[PDB]
Symmetry: D2
């Protein structure tokens, strides 16, 4: 709502990410009576140009990727004093640079003295943020010596402003669901995120990422905290992150000694997708013919407090799955009686990605003259990316950006399975599944051993 | 299921209510291959006809009022020698003569000696069964000295074997709705039975009954017992009736010193119904032009035990209402935290007469950018008389017929209002209402003074 | 407070079970103005005596077994025609003969019309009442064809009516103990009845009973029903029996298929009890030198309803144990969290035979710089005959100390699988013997230790 | 737990508090094997006598006060130049001169650069810390502009370390007391702190302090926060304060509009105490003979969350009460079924001041032949000031010292009451009570109008 006028600058040379995506996003929101006309988006890169030789570059991508129809200070990074060469006195910095450029790029910026104000300047950083627990802790120390915890924005994932608020109003404004969210009535919970695309062109990035560093830490660890936290005192941005952090300090893997009851991996083979054949992962361009690089990942978690004792959590994600979905399923206990010999347990679902809504399933009597029960259903549908982030940066509200406290608390949970999986091994014992199959056969025994089974989505 | 050969001895099957109703029902039951082809019907009345007259009367009654295409013996009712004049030996009697001829008939039939077989003879009694607590108690003594416990069937109301069983499975086979069925989460309950037609040709009977002996004691007191009972150990006939009695022994009117916070009566006058004008109750034929008989009744009860303490119950019934419905509505409390703005409390209703199914209401976020809530709905439909009464009497089912303990226990709670409303008073202080209006204006203040409102159907 | 005038007809065989046990009680309480002196005791037996010989015999025992300082009838039991021609019209009957006689002695009583009144005749019976499920139903059928429901009194275990009312007030008058009395907070329950005496001199009744028809069915099944029943509407006599019956219909033995996880038996041998060399079981007079009658018995039951689902119950009883106690112990769950600074479960007990009182154990911090925990407790004590009160209530009618006809047949059903298996002949060298002075036969310890628990030391 | 060696820099030691009270405590600690042998104490004052005259004030302050049997300077107070005249590299300051010299002293001490690294020096501030909400927020800004947290310790009151741990272990290590600690079973809570002494010689301080700024913001707020707080994740210095702050953000005075149902005040007069006459408040030296300072206060608060919704809290404190007692009492509800005759509700107490322990009252049957209940009791006793405060500062701990958030949050709650009693009024409207009487007669209607009574300690 009416962001204050400021000046924006860019880093990281002239990569196509900003010009084709970020610049059109600002232009699109400009013609909507949202941003003030006084913006003066100052450009900056690592290549010689002129003030007019790059103005047409914006038009080269705006109409080529969007609906269609500014000062250049290019210098030289290879000098320890280049920053000295560089409205209402406001600034916003961008760090669209290589992963190995942040510690160089923040130290000299702090030494310059531009980031010496609490309100005028802010700095944002690009994903990823470290590669393990040790690498993130060291990077957090450099940030703390140049800035405060009010001007740093980390872009890890985008869940949506309207998706978080839809869940908070459902649990905390109804007197019929909260008493049932505890260990006395719930049996187990399941979380699933599915995809139908393989690595298309990002073969150079996914090779060193895997499926635990890509989606498990960022995405599935944020849907898990929303369905297991305590009621906050307010919806204020810093009143929810405290409750989200508090629940991450009681979370642990189910088994630590034997890392086979709390984790499986996989990698997809050749198969049939959408009526056409598709190649295997190892035969794709840019991929080494003998690599592990997990694509599937299933984990089991436990929480130790007065509310969630004895209730396990199951997390599943992967690529080349039959369909694209995202869901949370809560299953209750069996009825404490048997006068109805005939009773399947009750399930409450929360659909997210395909069609937002709420479902509830229970048991009803089958018409006739003999006591038999069936299963019925109830439904409710609400309907019947970069645009939101930049607005929140301009206003200055930080609820889509993770704090520096919970970044290092999610790296600690997945530490054992990680350190087990980066260890080199024989490139012939990796479980495989066809492109179009829900899961490898090894992941079916993880849940079936407890007497349960996965959900057919 | 299959009945057994026997013989009927319907008393006074010459006047009415037998030739046009009982005989067609038995004929249609036999036509559908339900009753075994070994059955005899014998009339017993104060007439001097022959068999052929009975056959022609039965044929005329069946053809006139049903789809279409046995002996007789005269007898008196005031002489022991008369009964001396009167398959496999089984016998089932039927007493439908008059509301003054039950005790002589029962006493003489018991004295003569036909009703002396525990497993071979049964007796049924027509509605009503007594008029006060003392009048009902006296009739039980005569029955107790001539009859056994499993030989008496009392016909007062009809609910159907499918409506009772559809409600037991929903409650006791689900692990969600039982924890919320107590005083810690429920606010109040409401029960409503409405009708659109009243006193067509039964002005003689309705003058001495009123809407307290006609519907409140029989019908509305059986829907109230199923909503407040404890889970039984089985679905046996004896296992369920033992939990309905235990609830009626802890029920009392809310106010006993002042009979104005726990009871309201009314009567209907001229108005518009179905686009046509209708006459008033006092100007209807066969009715005294200064009558003081109520066609409306609202009460408030309280149950005092470990589960239903502090939760009131509201009961309402009447005639010439705008609609024909029957419902039970359970409303829950309000959420403690007020961090949300607009919060209507949740409700859960079970429709019966209007439609059979379940209704639910909760709160969901209004789309946009401001925190506003909007109430939504969930639905489920199951679909999309005097014929089962005669079937369960042939076999041994103690469910559709009330016991001897509930009859004298339902007459006790309504005693304070029965005595006060029966005393003579001037015929100018009755709260009249129009034909087509939900309730008298005096009934609005009974619930409004507590901070609530009558549900609008 | 005071009963009504009546006429009594005690004695059925003129044995040594009434002269020094029953009539002294009436005489003793006649001196305290408890009941009016408007009764005439009538003696009925198969022997021939005089009106003074009976009085002399009664005096021979009244002063020799009590505090010290009655028309007799003769004939035969099988021919009561002469006896029929004997205060208002009130009678109370008594039976003190062999079990095989109850049907002969109760079938002919109703034939003569002596029992043709609702509230003027009582037909109290001795113990036992049947020997198995099928034998009790047959006796119930004969009773139902002569007398009414509120006319039959069955002599059984004695609780005193003061212990029963002590638990009802404790449970149902406090708003601090009922919320925790369900499956969400309780781990398991234990019930124990101990004794320090052998078979004494009977040796003829215990040889055909064992410790399954002697204490388990009668005594231990009534302490179990009071601990697992739902609140009643009133403290009325017939309003508590309904709740007691409703619990026995959902009770079953765990592991019915394999009868080794739900029952152990035992017998005691020679040992030291009070510094003396107590002899073994198969050495006392009147006992066969090779017998397989149980003396110890442990069982495990499980209730299946909305409140007690998943909570097991443990029952233990025996003879020649080191001390005489009776107790009920309730153990709660562990705290759903671990104390953290960089825990034994709580028990609630209820003593009966050893002492009438309450106990409660919890955890407190140890004094010092560290935060180690202790096990502190809190206490409370109430204080800090049988055939004299069980007999004086038949004159007025109790309906509380005497069991009904439903629970009698319902308690015989749960213990049926273990009663049949233990009756089949078996090698008389595999009985789990134990020393006279120890608790368990060392094979009942694995019954509970297998689940991860332990018996209470007591 | 041995403190690290350091150099003490006591500020303003010329007063009658350091050498009389603080120095003997340090001496006694040094006699034991706790304090390190390398501890240098530096004296600061306003006057200049000699370098050895400071060593003779010790002889008159220790040899005759505690147990029987070092530098100096003459720096100014407000002068930048004067501070230039001023083991290991460790120091600890002790600022206690007056309640109006904290800002300039702190500013001039921080200007010289004596606080420039995380852990080399600590500053402790003597009570009081602010007078109103506005006067306490400004002092926090000055502190944050010179140093950071973890380096400042505020002395407000003294609650023993054993008492807090004794309270925490009892609540959170038992499985029978937590389920009953919520709104479904509790009626109300009472907290009481009583004394038996007057103003003594501190007539100059109590005149401008009152009974609202003493023991109602410091003492009674800490006892209230330990009873209404949620279980912490782990027992830690900064894990209990987070849960204590979260509770103070929900409390509020009941009936804010009318400040007479949420607060009473009083003042004592002449009476009998220990068999000896005692003077009234306005008859003692140094007190104005027409003062309106309260020596009594009773409040009523309410917490608004999912746990304490609808449960009031009653706070009471005063002077010249008959006995010295501190206690917390919790009273539960009444049993629904009323088939038992007399049922007083159960109470659970926690004695603190006279002797620590636990009590519990319940109902047992009175022996006899008729049904009548009794009241019994169960007990447990644990046994059967300026010493630790001078140790946690040297060792380094933040458990006995309040935080910055809690100081400004306790001042907000009592703001409406504080701002109303401060207004001028006629001296003849002050409630009065005798010296030896519990409460003024006006304070007995605050609780009796709800159908309750104060406890009879």
């Amino acid at each position: 709502r009416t962001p204050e006028p400021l000046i924006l600058t860019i880093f990281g040379a002239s990569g196509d990410l900003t010009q084709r995506k970020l610049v059109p996003a600002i232009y699109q929101m400009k013609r909507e009576r949202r941003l003030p006309p006084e913006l003066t988006v100052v450009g900056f890169a690592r290549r010689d140009w002129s003030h007019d030789h790059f103005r047409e570059q914006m038009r080269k991508g705006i109409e080529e990727f969007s609906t269609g129809i500014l000062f250049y200070c290019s210098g030289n990074m290879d000098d320890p004093e280049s920053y000295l060469k560089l409205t209402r006195g406001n600034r916003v910095f961008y760090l669209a640079v290589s992963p190995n450029f942040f510690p160089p790029g923040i130290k000299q910026l702090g030494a310059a003295g531009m980031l010496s104000d609490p309100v005028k300047s802010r700095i944002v950083i690009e994903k990823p943020f470290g590669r393990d627990l040790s690498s993130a802790q060291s990077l957090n120390r450099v940030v703390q010596s140049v800035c405060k915890e009010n001007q740093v924005y980390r872009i890890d994932h985008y869940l949506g402003k309207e998706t978080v608020q839809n869940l908070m109003v459902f649990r905390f404004a109804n007197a019929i669901f909260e008493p049932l969210w505890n260990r006395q009535f719930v049996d187990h919970v399941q979380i699933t995120v599915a995809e139908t695309v393989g690595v298309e062109e990002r073969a150079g990035y996914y090779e060193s990422a895997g499926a635990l560093r890509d989606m498990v830490q960022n995405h599935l660890m944020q849907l898990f905290c929303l369905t297991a936290m305590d009621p906050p005192n307010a919806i204020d941005a810093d009143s929810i992150r405290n409750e989200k952090v508090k629940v991450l300090q009681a979370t642990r893997l189910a088994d630590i000694n034997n890392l086979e009851n709390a984790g499986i991996r996989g990698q997809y083979k050749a198969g049939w997708m959408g009526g056409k054949p598709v190649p295997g992962y190892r035969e794709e361009p840019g991929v080494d013919p003998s690599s592990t690089t997990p694509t599937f990942a299933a984990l089991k978690l436990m929480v130790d407090n007065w509310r969630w004792q004895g209730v396990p959590f199951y997390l599943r994600t992967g690529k080349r799955m039959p369909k694209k979905v995202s869901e949370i399923a809560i299953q209750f206990r069996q009825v404490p009686l048997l006068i109805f010999q005939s009773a399947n347990p009750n399930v409450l679902s929360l659909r997210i990605q395909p069609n937002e809504g709420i479902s509830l399933r229970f048991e009803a009597k089958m018409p006739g003259s003999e006591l038999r029960t069936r299963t019925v259903d109830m439904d409710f549908s609400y309907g019947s990316a970069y645009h939101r982030l930049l607005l929140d940066c301009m206003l200055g509200d930080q609820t889509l950006f993770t704090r520096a406290d919970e970044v290092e608390e999610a790296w600690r949970v997945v530490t054992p399975v990680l350190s087990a999986w980066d260890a080199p091994s024989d490139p012939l014992s990796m479980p495989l599944y066809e492109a179009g199959t829900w899961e490898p056969a090894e992941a079916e025994w993880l849940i079936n051993k407890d007497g349960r089974r996965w959900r057919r989505l």
